[PDB]
């Protein structure tokens, strides 16, 4: 990564083995779970493209997903090149070259080049552009690797509501829809797939009800 | 978090992976248990809102609770906005803007903004405001996720008193009532749900008795 | 390794025991698996030839492979000497000597000599030359130590496609062919060795189909 030194300049320092291993261990343990994305984001703080390929290349397993991601990274990169055309005429001696999708992916650029772009004034955030592609591609994966739809979430005849509400906001946690739609899902689908005995109870709370009151309301059921 | 550097200034430094993992592991192991709250509090020392969303977003599992908390955080935030109205006229060039509920929740503010408020003179403790909302919402959860009432705590016919007294101050540990009420519960309910053989014993100690003397008094029973 | 000090110079520092042990543990656990190569590459960041012989010499087990590698390192070294002849006349007092294959392999050079070449201006990347030989020799090993050909990958009569597609991009992950050939393998061999029931399904998707749609298409089968 590129970090600030004591002297007050930005210099490159290598990433740590127990950081590396922590990246490995996350993937081992939580596979495609959503917590992987904030986790990634923290461990990618101040990271280079080069370090990001290192992290992706060091994965073992889940090769269908790893290929889907690659292909997303190239699509997003192809899109970078499309949206940002190359600039007019020859490159100035006094200046350094604009990046392409493949420089952002780290492929066509060298480390010193990656440090030039980020440390220079204005700086360009080629990490953050790759980061969105990774996060976007992470959404693709998460959405695919979900095994059950939100409509299929229902309360058992003997299942406590509580255990059901947990299941609901876990699956709701894997839905990516607008907040307004997710509000609609909350007031609607939760009660609808609730069991008759609690359903009866919840109808008596009326509208305007909040989760602690619903959760304490269906406790004996 | 925002920490003090050697030079004698407050600067931001990132939180550590084995700190992150320790947060994860606590949640894995002790779920909704009360020890989670002091634990949280220690690991949240000098933490930003941004770091607090990171910690909440990196949870896996217990999604009913995670949703209840979210909704508590927004309620407490809505309440911040209600209680503290926006201020008179345009924002001064010489000054920085007052926070809203969503800046406290970290949502509408940037990191540099979160560092402005905390490092500036006077400083404003937006961490500690979110912290109370988290702790308050933690009480809501703890109280809900308790599975047994204090009145339901009783001593077996063959159960040592000792094992019963442990159960009592564990459940008493999940009651949040005034101290005076909890004193009333101590002298009253403990003896009342104690078994006849020990109950008999405890009646002979009279009033004024302390726990070592009760605990040594019902030992052979 | 040779690392940059705080003062702003490149100085040698020793490699760490839990780095050493992490190298050991990788080899213990993942043997000849491809993830070993990025892993190696990260842990070899800023490393000397001397440190690279240390890492190779500290292996236990897999001695047939260790000998194959040695012999690859010497072949690649023999090739270095062939391609780069020694230079004209005596060595200048003002200059330091050009390396041979054996200096790159660390054998004929001393540490201070390895630091002279790398720290000097222009610097020569004798690590990166040995690194390619190691990676090249790693490909030789990986390809040999593969136990099954890509043509032998087929879908069971009761095996979910999904479990088969995972097997395919794992074996495809051990093929080293041009991308165009690997594209040809993707569209061709995958469907061809797919079972009749899913094969039927996949024929109905037509061409132009992508992996999420194939993977959701053969789910009930």
TrEMBL record, chains A, B, C:
Subcellular location: Host cell membrane; Host endosome, Host multivesicular body; Virion membrane; Virion
Binding site for ATP: 18
Chief site of localization: host cell
GO terms under cellular component: host cell nucleus; host cell plasma membrane; host multivesicular body; viral nucleocapsid; virion membrane
Protein's membrane topology: Lipid-anchor
Disulfide bonds: 198-218
GO biological process, one term: viral translational frameshifting
Annotated GO MF terms: ATP binding; RNA binding; structural molecule activity; zinc ion binding
Key words, A-Z: ATP-binding, Capsid protein, Host cell membrane, Host cytoplasm, Host endosome, Host membrane, Host nucleus, Host-virus interaction, Lipoprotein, Membrane, Metal-binding, Myristate, Nucleotide-binding, Phosphoprotein, Repeat, RNA-binding, Viral nucleoprotein, Viral release from host cell, Virion, Zinc, Zinc-finger
Protein name (Swiss-Prot/TrEMBL): Gag polyprotein
Organism: Human immunodeficiency virus type 1
Residues of the full protein shown: 133 to 353 of 403
